[PDB]
């Protein structure tokens, strides 16, 4: 019948915020004195793709409606996107075994799994 | 050494607990898991008799501490010499028995003439008005890590059913860490299985 | 105490039974009894009228010993006693030491007894026949604590036991009911009669 | 009965009290707006001493729990007879002290003899590096409820400084009410200044 | 000199939002059926003052920077300022005394404030 | 106990001083010794050198009665002494009863003592002047408890009186100092020196 929503608030919710949490610039850069400009000798060192991708804390994932936890690894493969695709190769890390179905703190210690059909 | 398997029989005989919380510093807790009661030194240990049948009066429930690792099993589950000499008994237990009761004035304590353990005997009551099961308050009186008595090596809580001849007609047994620390005890033994 | 005294039922071939008074559950009662769990509770200072229904008469020299003990098992060592701020008050009514939780007023032939083995407090009274009319002998009874008094009896029920004895001391009779002491009776039976119905 | 009115003298002292929250069971609290502290039996109550010159070696502070209310001025501040005969000794303080001081070897405890009543004495030492204040942790040994010794009965303890000699330097008194919910009892008691 | 900011972010940031508070509508009123029409005889019994005003609390006012703190007796005075200008007349409440210039809870009990100039 | 013995520092017409080994603060040090506290921090059943340093050399037949009192004032009646739990353990150097919180090895001639006033443990050695280059003549002290156990010491800190003595028994000098005995000596060394400051 009636309330034929002329829809606002489906899917393009995610699509239109652009300043609600990237926005996110801060210590600024004043009046800038420490300056010394030099010959480039020294290398790079990017930092690593392990302190970039998290490890699981244990407790966690409870209040955490699983749209939120299915994006924490969509975090840690969307950063990883770039990293198997263009740019400097890491290795996989530990973690990314449980990025699996049920859960990452799955029992395999102690079988007897309750015999049944 | 007394057998620690699970004994039915045809009464139906299976412990209950209380499902209480893992705070820090809970005074009685209990892991399904692995079937371990976590709790403290001269607490109220609520066990609660879940039977299938009434039994006939005289009958009576017997508690015994055994170890769970087989090294040990020579050893007698004994107050350490410490504990022993305290002043901390209830007026009715011996100073070398670990296991106690509470709330109950026909309490028996054994040192069996044989194996030389320690034993609890209360007479079963049947479940009161609106109650299914008769709840027992069990009072350890050593940790685990006490030195001379258990010394960090985990025990068994045998809860054995007898009548008054002594037949044996059910028995159930749990695991018991006896610490300070029984709820966050629990924790660091469930991490242990995951 | 080491031998604690028995707390079971004695009826005796003399049909020694309490009867107690049918009072209201008000708010500030001086003294009522509950049926349902035996229970008598009072104030301090006050007369607790116990009544001695018996099926025959005792002979000449006959005494009623009342005493009370806890009800709970893991304080059945500690003697139930006065308070040490109770015990140094100025409440004596010129016949009791000041230790002594019960107390008998209305007779002028009451004993109190610390006994040398089961080192506790007895109270006796002589017993009267009941009079022209009457059925039973009231017994005024006084308790000088109520249940909460620390150093004393400390939150723990108490049971009272009321025996008969002849003037040698063999028993003849025993009933025993809960006490449970505290500024409210009235109440104080209301919340434990809440605690049945569960 | 000795005197409760506030003596600065020329030392400028003044108590100082931690700025503690008023949850359910705290162990110490005090109110500015009543002067009142709140806290438990045998637990620990930092009291600041905030003075404005430093006074000579051999100074002692005196502190002495007075009844508030003029009625009951004739009673001692006593502990129960109950609390009298309890196994709560520290070692150095007789069994009848309602007030008590830790963290501190040299205290002295007197029962002054014309006027029957319960003094506690500490040494004063400078503040610290770093302080302003010299913090005397003090141990109240009874609730005001307790029957036979407050029996509620809102009390001031008086904290007083002395040299070696005895005469007043200077006084200051604050109201306590001890009993087993100090933040708690504070909040009623706020509820009882804040009319309506 | 530069840095001349066409302004963005000063007191015209109160005046803008008109959906960040206001809008917190509920318990919506689905399909409804429970309705009985009658006649209007019983009265009205608007509520008071007196819960509409909030009794200060001891332990708040810590985080709570006094633009809130000043503003929350402005929340308390703006719902009064319609109640002895048009409307139902209601009594001044108890705590509108301290709506003063220190603080709520002031020391008055326990003089001998500190002899000074 | 029954008076107990003074703790108080005698240094005596001897010049009887306690000297000790600059050891390291590690974690799991056999025996360390704090200057500003004077207090000894050991382990169970490890040696304890106490070297002794006296300005003139003593008689012969004198001896060094070592004694474990408990520093705080609300414990001094109860005796110091082992745990009912170590007083059962097979731990002993066939010279000890097993009560005895002190020990003494490297020493043929060790005596030990329950003293019939004070109801206490007494440890002697007999002195022996210092060696050849020596200055001091070092006693290894054992101590076969530590301070947290449960029916001993039960977390009281204690001091360890040194007394000097000839064959007869009267006092020559005495030096008192503190003793944590824990597991970690070194470490219980530095949270007490961040109690100082
Ligand atoms: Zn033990
Ligand atoms: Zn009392
Ligand atoms: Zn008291
Ligand atoms: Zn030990």
Chains 1, 5 share one sequence.
Not at chain 1, 34 to 51: A, G, H, Y
Not at chain 2, 59 to 74: E, G, L, N, P
Not at chain 2, 110 to 134: A, Q
Not at chain 2, 140 to 145: E, G, I, P
Request: hydrophobic content about 30%; some cysteine; aromatic content about 8%.
């Amino acid at each position: 019948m009636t309330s034929q929503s002329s829809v606002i608030s489906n899917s393009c919710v995610t699509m239109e915020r652009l300043s609600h949490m990237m926005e996110r610039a801060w210590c600024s850069q004043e009046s800038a004195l420490s300056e010394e400009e030099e010959d480039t000798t020294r290398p790079l060192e990017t930092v690593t793709f392990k302190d970039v991708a998290v490890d699981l804390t244990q407790e966690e994932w409870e209040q955490m409606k699983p749209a939120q936890r299915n994006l924490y690894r969509d975090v840690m493969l969307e950063n990883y996107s770039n990293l198997v695709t263009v740019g400097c190769q890491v290795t996989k890390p530990d973690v990314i075994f449980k990025l699996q179905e049920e859960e990452p703190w799955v029992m395999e210690e102690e079988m007897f799994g309750r015999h049944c059909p | 050494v007394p057998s620690q398997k699970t004994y039915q029989g045809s009464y139906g005989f299976r412990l209950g607990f209380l499902h209480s919380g893992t705070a820090k510093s809970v005074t009685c807790t209990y892991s399904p898991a692995l079937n371990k009661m976590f709790c403290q030194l001269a607490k109220t240990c609520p066990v609660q008799l879940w039977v299938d049948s009434t039994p006939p009066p005289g009958t009576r429930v017997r508690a015994m501490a055994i170890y769970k690792q087989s090294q040990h099993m020579t050893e007698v589950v004994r107050r350490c010499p410490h504990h022993e000499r305290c002043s901390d008994s209830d007026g009715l237990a011996p100073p070398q028995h670990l296991i106690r009761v509470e709330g109950n004035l026909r309490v028996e304590y054994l040192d069996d003439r044989n194996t030389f353990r320690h034993s609890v005997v209360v007479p079963y009551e049947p479940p009161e008005v609106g109650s299914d099961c008769t709840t027992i308050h069990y009072n350890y009186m050593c940790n685990s890590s006490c030195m001379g008595g258990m010394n960090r090596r985990p025990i068994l809580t045998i809860i054995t059913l007898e009548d008054s001849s002594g037949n044996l007609l059910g028995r159930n047994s749990f695991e018991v860490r006896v610490c300070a620390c029984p709820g966050r005890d629990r924790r660091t033994e469930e991490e242990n299985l995951r």
